[PDB]
Amino acid sequence: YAFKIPLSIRQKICSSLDAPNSRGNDWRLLAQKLSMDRYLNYFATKASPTGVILDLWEARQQDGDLNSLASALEEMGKSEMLVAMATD
Amino acid sequence: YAFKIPLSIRQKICSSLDAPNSRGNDWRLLAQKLSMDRYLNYFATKASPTGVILDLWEARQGDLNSLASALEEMGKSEMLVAMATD
Amino acid sequence: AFKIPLSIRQKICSSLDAPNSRGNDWRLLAQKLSMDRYLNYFATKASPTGVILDLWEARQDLNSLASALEEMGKSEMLVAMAT
Amino acid sequence: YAFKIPLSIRQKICSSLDAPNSRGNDWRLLAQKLSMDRYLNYFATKASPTGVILDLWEARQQDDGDLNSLASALEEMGKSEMLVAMATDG
Amino acid sequence: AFKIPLSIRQKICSSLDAPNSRGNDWRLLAQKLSMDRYLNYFATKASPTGVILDLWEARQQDDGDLNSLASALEEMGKSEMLVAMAT
Amino acid sequence: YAFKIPLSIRQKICSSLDAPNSRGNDWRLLAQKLSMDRYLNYFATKASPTGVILDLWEARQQDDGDLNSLASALEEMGKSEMLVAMAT
Ligand SMILES: O=S([O-])[O-]
Ligand SMILES: O=S([O-])[O-]
Ligand SMILES: O=S([O-])[O-]
Ligand SMILES: O=S([O-])[O-]
Ligand SMILES: O=S([O-])[O-]
Ligand SMILES: O=S([O-])[O-]
Ligand SMILES: O=S([O-])[O-]
Numbered sequence: 001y002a003f004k005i006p007l008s009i010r011q012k013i014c015s016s017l018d019a020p021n022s023r024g025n026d027w028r029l030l031a032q033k034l035s036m037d038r039y040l041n042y043f044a045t046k047a048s049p050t051g052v053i054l055d056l057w058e059a060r061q062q063d064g065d066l067n068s069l070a071s072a073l074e075e076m077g078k079s080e081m082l083v084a085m086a087t088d
Numbered sequence: 089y090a091f092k093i094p095l096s097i098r099q100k101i102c103s104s105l106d107a108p109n110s111r112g113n114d115w116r117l118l119a120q121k122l123s124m125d126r127y128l129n130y131f132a133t134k135a136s137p138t139g140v141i142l143d144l145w146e147a148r149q150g151d152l153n154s155l156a157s158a159l160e161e162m163g164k165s166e167m168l169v170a171m172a173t174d
Numbered sequence: 175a176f177k178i179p180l181s182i183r184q185k186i187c188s189s190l191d192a193p194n195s196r197g198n199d200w201r202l203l204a205q206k207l208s209m210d211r212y213l214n215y216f217a218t219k220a221s222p223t224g225v226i227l228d229l230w231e232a233r234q235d236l237n238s239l240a241s242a243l244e245e246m247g248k249s250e251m252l253v254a255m256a257t
Numbered sequence: 258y259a260f261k262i263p264l265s266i267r268q269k270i271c272s273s274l275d276a277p278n279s280r281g282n283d284w285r286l287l288a289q290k291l292s293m294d295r296y297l298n299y300f301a302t303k304a305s306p307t308g309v310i311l312d313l314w315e316a317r318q319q320d321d322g323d324l325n326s327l328a329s330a331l332e333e334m335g336k337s338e339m340l341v342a343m344a345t346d347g
Numbered sequence: 348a349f350k351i352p353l354s355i356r357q358k359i360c361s362s363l364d365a366p367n368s369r370g371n372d373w374r375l376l377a378q379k380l381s382m383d384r385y386l387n388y389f390a391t392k393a394s395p396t397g398v399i400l401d402l403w404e405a406r407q408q409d410d411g412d413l414n415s416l417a418s419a420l421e422e423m424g425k426s427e428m429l430v431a432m433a434t
Numbered sequence: 435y436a437f438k439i440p441l442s443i444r445q446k447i448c449s450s451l452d453a454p455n456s457r458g459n460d461w462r463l464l465a466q467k468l469s470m471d472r473y474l475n476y477f478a479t480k481a482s483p484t485g486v487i488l489d490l491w492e493a494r495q496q497d498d499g500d501l502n503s504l505a506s507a508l509e510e511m512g513k514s515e516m517l518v519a520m521a522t
Contacts, residue, residue, distance in 0.1 A: 001129050038148035041090065059130035070256035079244050085256035086240040175298055214258055215316035232299035260434055321434045328426040328433075337421050344417035344432030348475045387435055388493035405475035 003061040005069070010054055012084050013073070017050040025076060027053055033072035091150030097171060098142050101159070104167050105138040113162055115141055121158035176234040178227060182254050187223040189248065198246055200226055206242040259318040262311060266342050273336065274307035282334055284310055290330040349407035351416075356400055358431045359420075363396040371423055373399055379419035435492050437499025443520050444488055447508075450516060451484040459511055461487060467507040 005013075017027040027050040031037055034057055043049035057069065066085065073081045105115045115137040119125040122145045131137040145155075159168055178186075190200045200222035204213055207230055216222035230239055243251050262270070274284040284306040288294045291314055300306035317323055331340045363373040373396040377386055380403055389395040403416060413432060420428045439447075451461040461484040465471055468491055477483035491504060501520070508517055 039144055040147070042144050042147035055130055056127055059127045065257050067253070067257045070253045073256075074249050074253050082249075082252045082256045083237060083240045083244055086252065087237045212313055212316050215313050218312075218316075228302075229296055229299050232296050232302075321431065324430045324434060325426070328430050332424075332426050340426060340429050340433070341414075341417045341421045344420070344429035345412050345414045346433075384494035385490055386493075388489050391489075401476055401479075402473050406472045 001058050001061065002063040004058055005054055005066065006088070008088055009066075009085055010051075013054065013069075013081060014048055014050040016078070016081055018048055029076050030072060033075060034068070091146055093142055093146050093152065093155070096174075097152070098139065100167065100171050101142060101155075102136050102138040104164065106136050113164075114138075117162055118158060121161065122155075176231055176236065178231065178239075179254075182251060183224070183227055185251050185254070186227065186243070186248075187221050189251075190223040190226075191221050202246060203242055206245065207238060258315055259320055260324060261315060263343065263346050266339055266346075267308070267311060270311065270331075270336070270339055271305050271307040275305050283307075286334065287330055290333065291326055349404050349409060349411050351400055351404055351413065355413075355432050356397075359400065359428055360394045360396040362425075362428060364394045372396075375423055376419055379422060380415070435495065435499075436497050437495040438492055439488055439501065439504070443501075444485070446516065446519065447488065448482050448484040450513070452482055459513075463511055464507055467510060468503070 013030075017030055020026060027043060028040060030050065031040055031043060031053050034053065036043075036053060036056060043052050046052050054069075070082060070085055073085075101118075105118055107114070115131060116125070116128055118138065119128055119131060119141050122141060124131075124141055124144060131140055134140050142155075156168065189195055190203055192199065200216060201213060203223065204210055204216055204226050207226065209216075209226060209229055212229075216225050219225050227239075240252060240255055243255075273279060274282075274287055276283065284300060285294075285297060287307065288297055288300060288310055291310065293300075293310060293313060300309055303309045314327055328340050328343075331337060363376060366372055367375075373389065374386060376396065377383060377389060377399055380399065382389075382399060382402060385402075389398055392398055400416075417429055417432060451464055454460055461477065462474060464484065465474055465477060465487050468487065470477075470487060470490060473490075477486050480486045488504075505517055505520065508520075
């Protein structure tokens with residue numbers, strides 16, 4: 001789109017959040033941090049819910065940066081992910 | 089339980105609105121009506137732009153009346169009649 | 175070689191050089207990045223951190239700096255870097 | 258810091274090792290011999306790459322014994338004249 | 348009457364007094380300081396390097412330095428000593 | 435030592451030269467005449483400086499070792515008496 005998440009980062013965020021997490025700290029939390037909590041039931045049936053979430057996120061950007069994504073992962077305590085993004 | 093657009097109605101809407109329309113009376117207008125147009129770029133990359141819009145709309149939903157109203161505003165009277173008739 | 179953005183470098187140095195940051199300052203960062211052997215040198219500079227960051231850049235491990243900040247609770251700086 | 262290299266000696270060491278005419282026997286070799294080659298790029302940015310290497314060295318100066326790495330370095334670089342001056346002065 | 352700081356002498360003496368495997372001891376030092384003709388006398392006391400340094404001191408001007416000594420130790424490859432002096 | 439001074443003479447020379455006098459005719463002059471003036475400070479440290487001087491003098495003697503250079507120094511110092519005393 002007018003903006004795209006670099007592939008290596010998208011892949012890491014997805015591998016990390018797609019896995020169902022007993023305590024709610026999976027893609028569901030990202031969806032809530034990006035104000036897409038109303039659509040949870042739609043992402044739930046996709047092979048990669050995190051993938052759909054990030055596509056929608058990209059679609060609504062202008063040519064912006066990864067600040068709101070980095071910042072959401074931060075509030076989720078996804079420390080390693082943050083490091084991962086900076087590293088690349 | 090949860091709100092669900094009956095499949096036959098989803099398919100009917102998709103076949104009518106996914107089709108090419110010089111006037112723009114298609115999924116793009118439906119998206120605006122359903123307050124989903126912030127994501128038109130995403131919808132465009134899909135096989136059924138309308139299927140995705142309806143699925144997301146349903147999820148955030150339970151009244152089909154809001155949908156009918158959108159379609160009525162779009163002049164899709166022939167479609168509404170075909171649906172009612174089946 | 176590589177280079178940390180100036181606005182980021184500025185927030186790092188401001189925080190870690192501060193004496194009110196004792197216990198979570200340049201000394202900790204130096205240890206976390208394996209430059210403990212030169213603590214005494216950093217100490218003679220007005221900005222211990224600026225030098226630490228210069229050595230780190232030269233030694234380029236881009237993961238190590240971000241991991242150190244994360245471990246030091248510097249979330250905003252980390253977000254700035256992920257961005 | 259426990260021992261400071263005298264200024265006159267520091268000046269001549271830097272004059273020699275910073276010199277481009279000393280390639281093959283300059284600050285780069287000194288850094289490697291002092292186990293600091295990991296930071297070569299940092300030393301290159303300095304007006305005096307040798308001056309900074311020596312500041313770092315002086316910093317590691319814990320107690321008599323660490324001073325051997327340097328002396329050994331000068332000797333191996335043919336700069337013994339320099340070390341003869343350090344044993345002659347505080 | 349010039350003098351050598353105790354510590355340094357203590358070091359150098361116990362470092363050279365002990366006979367070295369290839370003659371690199373107070374003996375060689377003697378030759379470097381041109382006291383060749385006196386080895387027999389040095390080899391007649393508690394610490395050989397002791398008198399050698401003693402003779403050297405007395406020879407040094409009232410305001411001299413350990414230059415010629417350090418220089419001797421340099422050609423003998425005694426950096427180990429050119430550091431203790433430095434410190 | 436390629437030569438040793440008879441203790442009889444040694445004790446004689448030392449008793450005569452260790453005593454300081456206003457003639458400058460003591461161990462300091464002997465040291466000078468034997469080319470050892472540069473070590474004056476050292477000798478002054480010993481109980482018997484003349485003894486030390488004689489030790490160094492004995493030490494540098496070659497095979498032909500002869501009291502000659504020593505007797506000669508004494509002669510130039512106006513000790514001709516002590517010379518025949520050594521002649522005995
Ligand atoms: O188990 S995790 O959500 O910390
Ligand atoms: O998270 S809410 O805005 O759907
Ligand atoms: O758009 S059509 O189905 O009336
Ligand atoms: O394309 S028609 O429905 O205006
Ligand atoms: O000056 S050197 O590169 O031959
Ligand atoms: O050494 S002599 O005087 O018997
Ligand atoms: O008298 S001088 O030759 O030591």
